[PDB]
Amino acid sequence: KRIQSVPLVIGQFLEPIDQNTGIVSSTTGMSYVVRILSTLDRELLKPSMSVALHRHSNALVDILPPEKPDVTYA
Amino acid sequence: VGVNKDSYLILDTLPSEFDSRVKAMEVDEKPTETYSDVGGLDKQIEELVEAIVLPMKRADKFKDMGIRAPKG
Amino acid sequence: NDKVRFIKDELRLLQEPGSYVGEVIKIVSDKKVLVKVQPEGKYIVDVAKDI
Amino acid sequence: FDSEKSGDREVQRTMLELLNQLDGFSSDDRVKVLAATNRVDVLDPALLRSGRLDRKIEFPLPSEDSRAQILQ
Amino acid sequence: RYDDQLKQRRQNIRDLEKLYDKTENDIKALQSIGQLIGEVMKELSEEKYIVKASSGPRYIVGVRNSVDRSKLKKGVRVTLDITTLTIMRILPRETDPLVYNMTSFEQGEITFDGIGGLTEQIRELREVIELPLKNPEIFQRVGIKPPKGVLLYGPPGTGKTLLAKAVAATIGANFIFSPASGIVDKYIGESARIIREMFAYAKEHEPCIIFMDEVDAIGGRRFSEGTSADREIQRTLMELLTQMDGFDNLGQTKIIMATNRPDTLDPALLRPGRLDRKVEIPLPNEAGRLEIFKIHTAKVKKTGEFDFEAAVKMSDGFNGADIRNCATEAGFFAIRDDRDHINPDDLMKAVRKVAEVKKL
Ligand SMILES: Nc1ncnc2c1ncn2[C@@H]1O[C@H](COP(=O)(O)OP(=O)(O)O)[C@@H](O)[C@H]1O
């Protein structure tokens, strides 16, 4: 749970290859293979979601998720 | 200004050193073509030089009036 | 015991480095191939025991 | 040429410097710029705005009297 | 004798205490190595924020003890270290006085505006804009909602930048103005930060008027292809709209915009209720041009005459801003004849070239 703390680095999931390994094309520019950790969902990742990585390893850590009409029939 | 490589801090000013691909465009007087070598266009050259050498030399006729002068 | 093995194995190697991705152009004679890293240039390489 | 691409921006951004260079100095310091072209139905009127490049020359074709000078 | 040899020393020493403290100052700074600059997307907890550097990436970080977590919100500019990436200090007021500048004397309540050309406009904007600012507690109880914004369209070459500068200065309103060029010329992908600062600064100096020309530049692609490369040309419209909706339209901030091609405008917004009142504008007429030529030409040593009347009747098909040129179209002939007090002969043949200048 320690490394899951700061200072992380962002990325962008692309696709899996195994029960415990996926890939990323981060914002830094390049593409890296990387292993997800357990204690973590899987159901919520396959698209180009948003993610968070561990800097030096370039590992993976945890997930992160996120006009006004005013009228009425009277 | 100058600045360190690792701890970016101002260290020493320095001039504006121009590029070789600009100094090159400075020119000799290799041109040798007098206004007698050109035909017609007594006007256009007459109109031109009333924007160039007189402001280079005789701008007082402008500056005494101080009119909104031309640039190019 | 085999519980604490895993997490102590897993945590050992999230400290592990990254791993790049690339594509093959051809194969040099043996124990030698070439790759282009899909954003960037070429890198002849070696291979491992298994492949 | 509206875009966000590299090649479309770096071009025009030069022009954006040229303007600020024209409108940076005054008619006291004694530069005098000019220019040339084969076309006027193609270029941006911001250069033609009052102050930057105002005086113009409509170089015509030559009248028949001028034809006599040029050949001689 | 042996007193002066010492009296130069008390001067000597103090002339070093100055010297020392400097050379001891600088080393006190060199250890304080540099930092890195970013900007925020959103917020997650006092222990974890998000940032966006000035060299790409979108890091996640923490934060130091001292700085108030209150002031840290979206839009802010930020600074932090290089290794740990922990935010410490803030710098607001992204100054750019080449962009905008105030006119406090425009809060004079008796200011001069006497150039020519146009009267019913300056007469009506006084109606459009005065009352919602001075005592607007009536627009509510009567029932209506006043106009959040305005638009001033017309042909080019008309000198309206000075107009809106003027009439907000006689009324006694704090006027500020920034083109929509440098915000997208100097600032490619760091623009909309300036927008919101341009309002907050404008807020706490309430009341105040806005003016901003070349407004047709925000469009860019206008989502011409929906690619993620024109985010600047897209969002720069977004932050404009979200902010002007935030006024509540109470009567201590109003807005003006302008261009030549309203048919080229971006009615994705600014049409329906934001720039509600659209106002065209005219060109001069048989006497306005003497109302105009009485301005520029009056300010130079001519001979003194009234060929203006017989002149402008020869003039026709004539835009507005070509008149700073028309005088100086003649000034370039007075000096040729080596003169001081010009004659109308330069003016009678002044336009004779200028009419062909309109060709191209
Ligand atoms: N009604 C007017 N009175 C005085 N000068 C004018 C008038 N209309 C245009 N001008 C001249 O035109 C120039 C301003 O035009 P400009 O502000 O560029 O128009 P726009 O803002 O529509 O581009 C000034 O040099 C000014 O002297």
XYZ file of C-alpha atoms in Angstrom, chain C residues 13-51:
39
model
C 9.224 -7.117 -8.784
C 6.885 -4.220 -9.076
C 10.160 -2.610 -8.108
C 11.319 -4.380 -11.268
C 11.921 -2.286 -14.379
C 9.664 -1.642 -17.323
C 9.561 -3.595 -20.541
C 9.370 -2.214 -24.049
C 7.421 -3.276 -27.122
C 8.404 -3.628 -30.733
C 8.046 -5.472 -33.986
C 10.189 -7.699 -36.131
C 11.679 -6.844 -39.490
C 13.539 -10.098 -40.151
C 15.936 -12.415 -38.330
C 19.706 -12.314 -38.355
C 21.499 -15.675 -38.438
C 20.851 -16.967 -34.941
C 20.678 -15.598 -31.408
C 20.391 -12.265 -33.224
C 17.306 -10.497 -34.498
C 16.236 -6.934 -35.094
C 13.369 -4.856 -33.871
C 11.965 -1.440 -34.462
C 10.482 0.146 -31.397
C 7.190 1.281 -32.886
C 7.675 5.008 -32.062
C 11.417 5.032 -32.632
C 14.357 3.394 -34.364
C 16.070 0.059 -34.646
C 17.869 -2.122 -32.145
C 19.532 -5.417 -32.922
C 19.236 -7.682 -29.910
C 19.879 -11.113 -28.531
C 17.328 -13.529 -27.116
C 16.863 -15.646 -24.022
C 17.179 -19.328 -23.197
C 13.636 -20.352 -24.004
C 12.737 -18.940 -27.397
